[PDB]
Amino acid sequence: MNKVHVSAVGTGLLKNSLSADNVKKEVEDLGLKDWDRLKFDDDRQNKIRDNFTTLKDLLLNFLKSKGKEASAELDSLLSAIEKLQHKKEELYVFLYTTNTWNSKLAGEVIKNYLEEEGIKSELATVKSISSEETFHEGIEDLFDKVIYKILKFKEEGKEVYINATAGLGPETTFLTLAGLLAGADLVYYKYQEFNDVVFLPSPPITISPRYLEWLIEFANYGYTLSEKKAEELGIPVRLLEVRNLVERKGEDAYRLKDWVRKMLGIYL
Amino acid sequence: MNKVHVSAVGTGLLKNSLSADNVKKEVEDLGLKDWDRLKFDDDRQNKIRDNFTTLKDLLLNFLKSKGKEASAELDSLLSAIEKLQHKKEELYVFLYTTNTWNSKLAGEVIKNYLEEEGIKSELATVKSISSEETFHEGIEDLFDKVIYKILKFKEEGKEVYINATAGLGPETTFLTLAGLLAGADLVYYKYQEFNDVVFLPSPPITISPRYLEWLIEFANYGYTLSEKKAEELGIPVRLLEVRNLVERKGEDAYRLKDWVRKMLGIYLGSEFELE
Numbered sequence: 001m002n003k004v005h006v007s008a009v010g011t012g013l014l015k016n017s018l019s020a021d022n023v024k025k026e027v028e029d030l031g032l033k034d035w036d037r038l039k040f041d042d043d044r045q046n047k048i049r050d051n052f053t054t055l056k057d058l059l060l061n062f063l064k065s066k067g068k069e070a071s072a073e074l075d076s077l078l079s080a081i082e083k084l085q086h087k088k089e090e091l092y093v094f095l096y097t098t099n100t101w102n103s104k105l106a107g108e109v110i111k112n113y114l115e116e117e118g119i120k121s122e123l124a125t126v127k128s129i130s131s132e133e134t135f136h137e138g139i140e141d142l143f144d145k146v147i148y149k150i151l152k153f154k155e156e157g158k159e160v161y162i163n164a165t166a167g168l169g170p171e172t173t174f175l176t177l178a179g180l181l182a183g184a185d186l187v188y189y190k191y192q193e194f195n196d197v198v199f200l201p202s203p204p205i206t207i208s209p210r211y212l213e214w215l216i217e218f219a220n221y222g223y224t225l226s227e228k229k230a231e232e233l234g235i236p237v238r239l240l241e242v243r244n245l246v247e248r249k250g251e252d253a254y255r256l257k258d259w260v261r262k263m264l265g266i267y268l
Numbered sequence: 269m270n271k272v273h274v275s276a277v278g279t280g281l282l283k284n285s286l287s288a289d290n291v292k293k294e295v296e297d298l299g300l301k302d303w304d305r306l307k308f309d310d311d312r313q314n315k316i317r318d319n320f321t322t323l324k325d326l327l328l329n330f331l332k333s334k335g336k337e338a339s340a341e342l343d344s345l346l347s348a349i350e351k352l353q354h355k356k357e358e359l360y361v362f363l364y365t366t367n368t369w370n371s372k373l374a375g376e377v378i379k380n381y382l383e384e385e386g387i388k389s390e391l392a393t394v395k396s397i398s399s400e401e402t403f404h405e406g407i408e409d410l411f412d413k414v415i416y417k418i419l420k421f422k423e424e425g426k427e428v429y430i431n432a433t434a435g436l437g438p439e440t441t442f443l444t445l446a447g448l449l450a451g452a453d454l455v456y457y458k459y460q461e462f463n464d465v466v467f468l469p470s471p472p473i474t475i476s477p478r479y480l481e482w483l484i485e486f487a488n489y490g491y492t493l494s495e496k497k498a499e500e501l502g503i504p505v506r507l508l509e510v511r512n513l514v515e516r517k518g519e520d521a522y523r524l525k526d527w528v529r530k531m532l533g534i535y536l537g538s539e540f541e542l543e
Contacts, residue, residue: 039461129459132464135466139469165437169440169457170459173432173441173455173468176441176444177444177445177448177469177471185510186510191436191437196399196400200442201407201445201527203449203479203513206475207473208473208474209474209477242427242453244470
């Protein structure tokens, strides 16, 4: 399994499955009508939790019935595997989703489907983003659960392919960017439109070397300074502050942002 | 205008405006029910072109009436401007949209609304992506109309902020990545289910220097290398082929892919192939 595909999983499968009368019936009977849009802390998440095994089998039967197009994630994954001619014996699919019952339901059904197709996979869960505070925690969690896994796959000598299709705006862009900094080989994307997988300009990137030297220096003075130590060591803290890398936390001091610490994990 | 925001414009505004019964009426009278989802070469694009002034004023009055939240683009842009405290005198908004009448309609209304709010802006158009062939041409045009414009704004000494809200999937991942390579300072995004904009980790990035040296070497040898010659230069052509940087041309030749040459224009200058 030298060929890893990485993909987020959303709730599109749950929404699509309401097209089957048997699923719609069960979802309405359980009181789960808008199950594909439940927020992280909606009490109706607990109806999914309580019925998890029976909802898994129900959605796996639906997906078996309808095929890969029931999941935009499966659809992009399996199309890309076909287009790249990756063999099942060489494949590992790293799925991730938010730690919410509706998302985990989708992820486990996709994992079970791939395993019956003879493709090994895992499902990792990341904190939900429900607010601006939790956005930053969510990003850090993506570094720990996903980006560091990419880095480790690359150090084992695996090829890593990122499915940009699935996910909400900012998480997919962050996944792609940080994924490429971690050494991912290629990013792809399926348009439903023309039913074909394209390869994004996936240039291999690094943190700008001027900036990486300054940032590694910070991680030798704790994780703050005073302004006469930054101009001291040729660090344009104004430019660091505009580019969102330091926060004036001190009172003429500067401070190194937690996501930046996580990211230095790629290099140190 | 030393604070430049870059944002795509989509047809969400057109769809949203049908909430207002005066707009819905007028659009339905012209036979423009699905005007937010027309394909680039749908004959109804001509009905938009032919009624453009009328539809512009109608959407602009709807926008005035219902507020910025009728456009995910305006909403993210103006929320971001507020959160960053960017002043009207310092602002310039570079909008871009596909060269289709429904999109140009959305873009002109947003441009007009920003200008009435005292924000100078311009609207560039880029080729439609309607297929796999057109995907690559589409990306090249985004390099030429948007990414090279970011490079120019940076060379003028301006700061550049990218609105990563608006767009289908792949365009905004491309704009984020290539815009950061071109020196963009910050990327932001507005979540619907909150009132506020978040700032993405917008790390300053460059092409990996090992790869940039390898890719520049192709340019010195006519953009093709034998496997043997690639070896003598320390260029791992099979790795480059896995990352889609080169394409195998015959039994024993590797050619730099076209897209890579657009990206190298970031470091060598847009015209570098012509010298």
